[PDB]
Amino acid sequence: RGKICTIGIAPWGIVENQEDLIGRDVVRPYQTMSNPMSKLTVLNSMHSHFILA
Amino acid sequence: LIENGVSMHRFLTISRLEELYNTRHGPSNTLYHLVRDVKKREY
């Protein structure tokens, strides 16, 4: 029953590729390529909902 | 390769799909008879 309805309270600056998330009502793909040296932390893709505080 | 991330959208750029049909480096296809038959009917 994989409708878990998880919500991720993450800061807008702590996430990676902030320019990838620009756009109103537009679907934006995001690769799960984890950069080991980037301070911008990768997401957990298989969370279902996200809050960008 | 899609699990590591290959972006299957950006893979497809016309001529790459062109070599995908003309590749004989695999199992046999009936497509050699199909394209020949439709060229005969069109011409």
Q: Report how far apart, in Å, the C-alpha atoms of B27 and of each of A36, B15, B18, B32 are.
A: 41, 21, 17, 13
Count of residues in chain B: 43
Reported structure resolution in angstroms: 3.8
Maximum separation of any 2 CA atoms in chain B, in Å: 46
Give Dmax over CA atoms of chain A in angstroms: 36
Rounded Cα distance, A34 and A41, in Å: 8
Question: Taking CB atoms and an 8 Å cutoff, what residues of chain A touch B1?
Answer: none
Interface of B with A in 1-43 (CB under 8 A): 5, 7, 9
Q: What amino acid occupies position B4?
A: N
Query: Do A32 and B5 count as a contact with CB atoms less than 8 A apart?
Result: yes
The continuous run of DSSP H or E covering A29 comes out as none
Closest chain B CA to residue A31: B5
- C-alpha B22/C-alpha B20 separation (Å) is 6
- Across B19-34, b (16+ Cβ under 10 Å) vs e yields eeeeeeeeeeeeeeee
A15-46 per-residue burial string, b: 16 or more CB within 10 A, e: under 16: bbbeeeeeeeeeeeeeeeeeeeeeeeeebeee
